[PDB]
Paper text:
Many antibodies capable of neutralizing a large fraction of circulating [name] isolates, broadly neutralizing antibodies (bnAbs), have been isolated from [name]-infected individuals. [name]-class bnAbs are attractive vaccine leads owing at least to their potency, breadth and protective capacity, and to the fact that their in vitro neutralization curves typically saturate at 100% viral neutralization, in contrast to some other bnAb classes (V2/Apex, PGT151, and 10E8) that fail to reach complete neutralization for some isolates, likely influenced by glycan heterogeneity. The H-CDR2 patch makes direct contacts with four gp120 elements (loop D, β15/α3, β20/21 and β23/V5) in all [name]-class bnAbs. Thus, while the [name] Env trimer has evolved a glycan fence around the CD4 binding site that imposes steric and entropic penalties to antibody binding, [name]-class bnAbs appear to have evolved solutions that avoid glycan clashes and partially offset the entropic penalties.
Author numbering:
A (entry chain H): 1 to 52, 52A, 53 to 82, 82A, 82B, 82C, 83 to 100, 100A, ...
B (entry chain A): 2 to 171
C (entry chain L): 2 to 30, 33 to 91, 96 to 213
Amino acid sequence: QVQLVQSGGQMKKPGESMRISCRASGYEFIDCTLNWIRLAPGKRPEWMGWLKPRGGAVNYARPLQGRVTMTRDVYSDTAFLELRSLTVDDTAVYFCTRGKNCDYNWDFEHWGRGTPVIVSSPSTKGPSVFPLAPGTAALGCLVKDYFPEPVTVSWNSGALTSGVHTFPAVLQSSGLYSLSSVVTVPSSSLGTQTYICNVNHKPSNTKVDKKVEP
Amino acid sequence: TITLPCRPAPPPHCSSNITGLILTRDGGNSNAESEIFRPGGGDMRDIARCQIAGTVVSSQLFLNGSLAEEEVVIRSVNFTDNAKSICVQLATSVEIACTGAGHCAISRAKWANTLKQIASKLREQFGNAKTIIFKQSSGGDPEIVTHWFNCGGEFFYCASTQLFASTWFA
Amino acid sequence: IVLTQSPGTLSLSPGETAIISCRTSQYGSLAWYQQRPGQAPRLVIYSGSTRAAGIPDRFSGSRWGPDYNLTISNLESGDFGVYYCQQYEFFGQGTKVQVDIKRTVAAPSVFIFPPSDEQLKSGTASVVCLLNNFYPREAKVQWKVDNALQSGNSQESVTEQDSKDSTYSLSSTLTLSKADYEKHKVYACEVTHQGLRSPVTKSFNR
Ligand SMILES: *[C@@H]1O[C@H](CO)[C@@H](O[C@@H]2O[C@H](CO)[C@@H](O[C@@H]3O[C@H](CO[C@H]4O[C@H](CO[C@H]5O[C@H](CO)[C@@H](O)[C@H](O)[C@@H]5O)[C@@H](O)[C@H](O[C@H]5O[C@H](CO)[C@@H](O)[C@H](O)[C@@H]5O[C@H]5O[C@H](CO)[C@@H](O)[C@H](O)[C@@H]5O)[C@@H]4O)[C@@H](O)[C@H](O[C@H]4O[C@H](CO)[C@@H](O)[C@H](O)[C@@H]4O[C@H]4O[C@H](CO)[C@@H](O)[C@H](O)[C@@H]4O)[C@@H]3O)[C@H](O)[C@H]2NC(C)=O)[C@H](O)[C@H]1NC(C)=O
Ligand SMILES: *[C@@H]1O[C@H](CO)[C@@H](O)[C@H](O)[C@H]1NC(C)=O
Ligand SMILES: *[C@@H]1O[C@H](CO)[C@@H](O)[C@H](O)[C@H]1NC(C)=O
């Protein structure tokens, strides 16, 4: 029964180096090529490289060419992944894998439990809140250009529950999250009641209150 | 005439003809502008499965093996599989000469000609015209990283770092 | 060489078939990996149609030309999650088979929001398209500027199926900068949905 046990989850600062181990038992270690694959949230799975234990033959993925280095120890049946010059993009759960059959390498039957890494820059970007205004009417707030996740909006400090829809954030090419939060209210109400959304962003300790005037 | 940093120094009778070589292909893709190739990265089973080998046990470079007729012939189980080693056989051999002083000389111009042939055949397999890069090994044991062979029951380690450092266009 | 999976998010109730498609750009055996939430991903299908270990016969792979299908005949809780397709070292973007309570069809109430003047000063301009309370989740939003389609400049998001409503809401964030925005005077958001007879359009002038 093949087992791929790897290191525990790590927290790293940007620009630092990282080492992760993965030892395996249940099969003869030297026989099968070993791969590393990182999975980022809302992102394509990414193959990092493979490593052939008999002679330490190695093949690094071209995007990572400079910053990736993986080695092996034959005697304790283990492989090590090393990632230098960390960036916030590199936050992912890192898996060591081995194929089903010993040399068709790509049918990844066996995965580790995963080693989650979290590089997070102490630099944070406060939310920019922009109103959205018009039988029934809708008015909301655009929480644009903030970093990182998450923010939690509300309306009238919680007086408004019904009709409110807050949306999952969206990663713009800017690298900064922008979400929207709308509410549907009666058309008449636009004149009678004032509508304030309360954007709360703990990573920056910013807590913006914004009004949506008709 | 390129020379080889060699450890230890190889006696004259160890000087021989080069027949072929082993190329591992770097995993893609970026943009299919170019392909990176490195020596070795091949297990002994890949070498045996290649069937062109001679008597000499070696890494990266086939020695004292059988040549193939007319054109350089490249073979792999699957070329689109970068985990599979590429076997290269030459019609014209390349006489690697060891002085015994510790540096193995080689005809630079001739090795340029053979390399151009390989790159041409690689393009034939990997698409009409992709620029081809030859770089040194990514890493591993000295036997895989350095060109390592056996002569008279004694092992020798030569660095092909000088050798594999080219780039070809079309 | 890239792998394109469709749909991005397939959603439907337990007890009915789910079908996932993966478009390839080259030859080579293709695999299918299931990934349950929080758990490591699991190899479902390899070499096109052969199932891995512990995979029931409810999973089948189908191939025609460059296209591959993973069909899960009878949806159980354990089947829901996110599926990826693979060809050598490359993966597809992913698909998310998620649960969906069946209810009556509802047409979306659409609103369009011009960009905040303060944002306009900052240099950027974000036009928002709101689609509220519609069933089912599959609905298409088309951005046109001076009656001209747009691609890649816009982004989207859909709510979790709201418990009371059992209905989906969508937000389309159309993003520009001040220059291009002021140039074009008039903008329109086009919504085509199952509960809609005709593509409802919501537009405005600068
Ligand atoms: C590394 O390894 C990988 C594997 O891991 C290798 O990948 C394999 O590579 C093979 C060769 O390169 C490749 O075979 C090709 O596949 C072609 C496409 O096959 C699919 O599409 C067929 C229908 O296509 C039609 O429609 C699409 C789009 O709609 C168009 O693109 C096409 O042009 C057509 O218009 C479809 O029939 C086929 O399924 C059959 O094959 C499957 C095998 O996996 C079966 O499961 C399936 O049931 C079908 O089987 C039927 O047909 C076979 C005979 O092919 C028969 O045995 C069965 O009983 C059943 O009847 C796929 O869905 C395909 O077009 C190619 O076929 C032509 O060429 C061969 C010669 O190679 C001829 O013998 C054949 O008759 C046919 O002739 C055509 O071409 C002639 C000249 O080439 C021409 O004269 C003639 O008029 C015809 O046009 C061929 O089979 C594999 O698909 C591929 N495998 C995978 C998984 O991707 C890879 O190559 C390796 N890498 C390297 C570098 O070597
Ligand atoms: C290879 O062959 C040559 C001559 O054919 C011979 O001198 C040499 O000893 C052989 N072995 C090696 C390792 O060069
Ligand atoms: C290599 O082969 C050639 C002819 O094929 C022969 O003349 C030469 O002696 C051989 N050995 C060396 C070291 O070149």
